[PDB]
Amino acid sequence: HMFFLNLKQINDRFNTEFITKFKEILESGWYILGKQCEKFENNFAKYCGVKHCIGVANGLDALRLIIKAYDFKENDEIIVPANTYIASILAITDNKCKPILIEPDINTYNINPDLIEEKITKKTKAIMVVHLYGQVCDMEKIQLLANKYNLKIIEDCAQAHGAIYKDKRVGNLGDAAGFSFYPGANLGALGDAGCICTNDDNFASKIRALANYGSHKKYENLYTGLNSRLDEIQAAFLDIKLKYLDEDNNKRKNIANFYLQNIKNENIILPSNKFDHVWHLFVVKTKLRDELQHYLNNHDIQTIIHYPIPPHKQKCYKDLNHLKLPITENIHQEVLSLPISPTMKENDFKKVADILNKWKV
Amino acid sequence: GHMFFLNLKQINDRFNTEFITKFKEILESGWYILGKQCEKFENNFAKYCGVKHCIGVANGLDALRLIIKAYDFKENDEIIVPANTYIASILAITDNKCKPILIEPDINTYNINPDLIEEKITKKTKAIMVVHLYGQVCDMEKIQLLANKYNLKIIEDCAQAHGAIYKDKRVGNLGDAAGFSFYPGANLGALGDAGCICTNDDNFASKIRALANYGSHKKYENLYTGLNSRLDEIQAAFLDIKLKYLDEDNNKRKNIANFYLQNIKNENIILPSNKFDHVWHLFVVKTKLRDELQHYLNNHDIQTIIHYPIPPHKQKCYKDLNHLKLPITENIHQEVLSLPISPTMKENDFKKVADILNKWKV
Ligand SMILES: Cc1ncc(COP(=O)(O)O)c(/C=N/[C@H]2[C@@H](O)[C@@H](C)O[C@H](OP(=O)(O)OP(=O)(O)OC[C@H]3O[C@@H](n4cc(C)c(=O)[nH]c4=O)C[C@@H]3O)[C@@H]2O)c1O
Ligand SMILES: Cc1ncc(COP(=O)(O)O)c(/C=N/[C@H]2[C@@H](O)[C@@H](C)O[C@H](OP(=O)(O)OP(=O)(O)OC[C@H]3O[C@@H](n4cc(C)c(=O)[nH]c4=O)C[C@@H]3O)[C@@H]2O)c1O
Ligand SMILES: [Cl-]
Ligand code: NA
Numbered sequence: 001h002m003f004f005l006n007l008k009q010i011n012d013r014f015n016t017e018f019i020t021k022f023k024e025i026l027e028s029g030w031y032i033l034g035k036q037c038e039k040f041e042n043n044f045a046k047y048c049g050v051k052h053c054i055g056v057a058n059g060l061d062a063l064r065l066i067i068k069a070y071d072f073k074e075n076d077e078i079i080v081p082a083n084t085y086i087a088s089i090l091a092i093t094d095n096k097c098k099p100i101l102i103e104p105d106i107n108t109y110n111i112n113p114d115l116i117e118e119k120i121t122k123k124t125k126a127i128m129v130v131h132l133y134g135q136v137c138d139m140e141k142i143q144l145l146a147n148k149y150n151l152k153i154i155e156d157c158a159q160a161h162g163a164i165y166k167d168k169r170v171g172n173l174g175d176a177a178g179f180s181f182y183p184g185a186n187l188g189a190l191g192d193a194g195c196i197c198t199n200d201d202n203f204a205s206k207i208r209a210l211a212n213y214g215s216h217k218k219y220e221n222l223y224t225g226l227n228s229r230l231d232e233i234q235a236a237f238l239d240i241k242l243k244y245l246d247e248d249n250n251k252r253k254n255i256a257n258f259y260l261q262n263i264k265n266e267n268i269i270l271p272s273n274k275f276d277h278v279w280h281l282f283v284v285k286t287k288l289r290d291e292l293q294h295y296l297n298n299h300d301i302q303t304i305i306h307y308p309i310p311p312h313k314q315k316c317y318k319d320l321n322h323l324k325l326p327i328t329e330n331i332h333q334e335v336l337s338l339p340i341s342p343t344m345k346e347n348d349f350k351k352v353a354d355i356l357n358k359w360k361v
Numbered sequence: 362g363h364m365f366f367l368n369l370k371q372i373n374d375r376f377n378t379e380f381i382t383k384f385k386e387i388l389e390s391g392w393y394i395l396g397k398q399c400e401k402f403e404n405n406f407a408k409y410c411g412v413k414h415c416i417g418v419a420n421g422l423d424a425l426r427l428i429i430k431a432y433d434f435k436e437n438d439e440i441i442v443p444a445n446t447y448i449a450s451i452l453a454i455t456d457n458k459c460k461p462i463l464i465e466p467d468i469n470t471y472n473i474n475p476d477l478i479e480e481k482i483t484k485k486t487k488a489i490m491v492v493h494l495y496g497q498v499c500d501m502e503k504i505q506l507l508a509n510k511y512n513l514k515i516i517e518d519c520a521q522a523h524g525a526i527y528k529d530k531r532v533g534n535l536g537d538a539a540g541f542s543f544y545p546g547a548n549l550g551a552l553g554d555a556g557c558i559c560t561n562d563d564n565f566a567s568k569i570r571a572l573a574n575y576g577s578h579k580k581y582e583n584l585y586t587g588l589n590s591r592l593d594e595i596q597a598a599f600l601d602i603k604l605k606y607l608d609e610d611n612n613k614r615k616n617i618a619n620f621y622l623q624n625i626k627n628e629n630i631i632l633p634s635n636k637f638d639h640v641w642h643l644f645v646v647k648t649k650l651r652d653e654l655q656h657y658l659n660n661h662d663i664q665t666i667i668h669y670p671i672p673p674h675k676q677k678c679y680k681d682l683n684h685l686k687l688p689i690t691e692n693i694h695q696e697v698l699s700l701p702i703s704p705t706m707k708e709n710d711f712k713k714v715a716d717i718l719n720k721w722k723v
Pocket of ligand 4: 057192229231419553554591
């Protein structure tokens with residue numbers, strides 16, 4: 001079977017250095033908040049063009065912490081795309097803020113900036129942008145609304161490592177940014193991992209303390225914090241792979257281009273890349289989505305849906321189930337992700353295209 | 362020749378070849394989260410604690426936070442807890458919008474004084490969190506009775522007390538649910554952050570598994586508003602390797618602690634004589650001249666750490682508790698200092714600690 005995402009193929013490239021670094025860490029006797037974390041932070045901050053990177057435990061923790069650090073009041077509002085992955089929302093509700101869900105543009109799969117302002121109220125305190133599937137969101141009007149209404153901009157960068165907008169990288173487009181380095185991310189760890197990026201010295205220092213039980217200095221707790229740290233081992237593996245991240249994204253770009261140039265099937269709506277797209281996911285759209293996934297599985301092609309139930313329709317968010325979000329709803333009914341990975345072989349991506357072209361429904 | 366407080370390199374060096382072997386196994390698998398290593402570790406740790414269910418999670422604070430979250434308590438519900446525990450025990454309560462009710466310890470065990478608990482029970486009380494502090498199991502008998510009398514949950518914080526035994530059961534199996542840290546300095550320590558939740562209750566275990574996986578029990582679906590709190594395959598594997606030697610290692614710590622208890626004799630030092638089973642995560646001595654003694658031991662090339670010098674109610678993050686009068690707690694925090702102990706600690710190292718203490722005239 002062709003895997004959706006063959007992480008062994010992706011990581012095998014680095015095994016020798018993974019084992020060297022692991023042995024270096026064993027020799028150091030230091031496994032938490034050490035030289036590897038510092039090195040990776042400094043390199044990832046450089047990569048994103050930001051002053052400060054704080055290694056944390058995962059992408060949801062990254063968001064949760066950013067919101068926490070802003071000390072919003074219970075029920076304050078955070079504008080967010082309605083079609084993002086549920087963890088973007090969980091971060092908001094975990095802080096007892098209210099998610100205000102906005103429809104995406106069908107031609108980007110990202111928040112439609114034109115639909116935000118109408119939803120801003122006295123309680124709105126932040127906009128969470130999500131660079132979904134790999135494509136950076138059009139920030140122009142979002143930044144204008146943030147300045148106009150005194151809103152924080154929070155970036156969810158879990159799916160768009162390295163994507164660029166004008167002169168900047170995702171991670172440097174708002175006030176603070178959360179990354180996942182979950183193993184399937186464009187920069188993936190060998191375990192759970194994440195980070196927070198910002199230019200604000202004071203916010204950075206708060207965040208560090210907050211992710212370390214609320215302790216800035218040994219023995220002392222300035223805040224009621226969490227334990228959300230990036231392990232030395234994972235920092236070291238990330239730093240190894242970071243050197244190849246733009247290359248790996250360019251290998252995705254190549255595959256996505258092959259798909260775009262070769263899949264010709266009237267039942268399939270292909271993704272476009274209006275702005276920079278690092279192609280974490282290659283998302284097609286069809287009225288016969290389940291049929292297509294079954295067909296592809298018959299042809300030994302593994303696929304995953306991102307995503308078939310939207311946050312507002314989840315059982316955990318019963319109070320949202322009534323919201324009318326037909327664009328988001330229709331997307332969740334229609335999308336399927338095609339295998340794409342930096343290391344994916346030409347014969348595999350050729351086969352995917354050929355089998356999709358043969359789909360006659 | 363500086364004696365390190367806890368020489369983890371020396372603790373872990375015994376397992377290096379095994380660690381590397383398993384790491385390469387995991388690379389071969391291409392599975393790094395929620396895999397075979399986690400399942401295997403959980404199964405073994407559950408057997409070790411004598412419980413039905415072990416759920417690996419990201420760290421010990423998360424473990425406690427998830428337990429409390431799983432019980433779905435009302436805002437401002439009360440959780441009885443020792444006043445002298447590590448702050449993380451409290452953070453787990455307040456993060457869940459519950460109210461901690463701080464109970465003085467017994468001066469001679471450093472654990473919650475069970476005889477002070479009932480007077481603080483109210484209609485809002487939902488649970489007692491017991492903490493097995495420093496490695497000493499709490500005297501659970503009265504605590505379990507009380508919990509039954511008032512229909513309260515017992516939550517164990519087992520971060521410092523891996524493998525200790527109260528009568529016929531292990532820590533982990535002494536309440537309704539138990540949180541463990543496997544922070545690297547723990548008696549069973551990982552090589553990064555790690556924890557677990559132990560319980561006998563099937564529904565509680567499944568609910569915890571979902572709550573630690575975004576709230577998701579089934580791919581694509583979220584039953585609860587959860588969090589991401591998982592035990593990496595690599596840390597599970599490392600923990601499984603060391604779990605085979607944990608009872609041996611704990612008994613080695615007992616040997617060294619009993620050396621200290623029997624060989625240190627100084628009128629300025631109160632030794633931690635144990636009233637119940639103790640696995641000696643920390644060996645805590647107590648003196649009126651604590652800062653003086655730490656400087657004395659540093660001068661003699663012996664590194665110590667304090668557990669702890671500021672109690673939770675006096676921290677800046679808990680300004681609304683700073684007023685509470687907890688004199689036993691406050692006194693302990695002024696007077697405690699931890700001595701180096703470990704299962705690999707060299708004879709000449711512990712003998713030097715004892716001798717240098719015996720020489721201290723203050
Ligand atoms: C009762 C109770 N409940 C819940 C919790 C929360 O559990 P966690 O969320 O898993 O931390 C704790 C945690 N309790 C721990 C932790 O929260 C920890 C960070 O702080 C204290 O422990 P301590 O002050 O001894 O920790 P440390 O960082 O100084 O490490 C101990 C020694 O080991 C050495 N070392 C350490 C590291 C990390 C290394 O890589 N290499 C190395 O050689 C350095 C030190 O000499 C607490 O007692 C607790 O005690
Ligand atoms: C927009 C946004 N914001 C915040 C977050 C929260 O970030 P975290 O808290 O770090 O997860 C996410 C996470 N987003 C991710 C994650 O939450 C993740 C668990 O679930 C989805 O991703 P997906 O359905 O693709 O994940 P998956 O587990 O199926 O793995 C992808 C593939 O990789 C293969 N695999 C996976 C693993 C773990 C392995 O060891 N070996 C292996 O071969 C199996 C699959 O074929 C989400 O899109 C997000 O998309
Ligand atoms: Cl067919
Ligand atoms: Na972790």
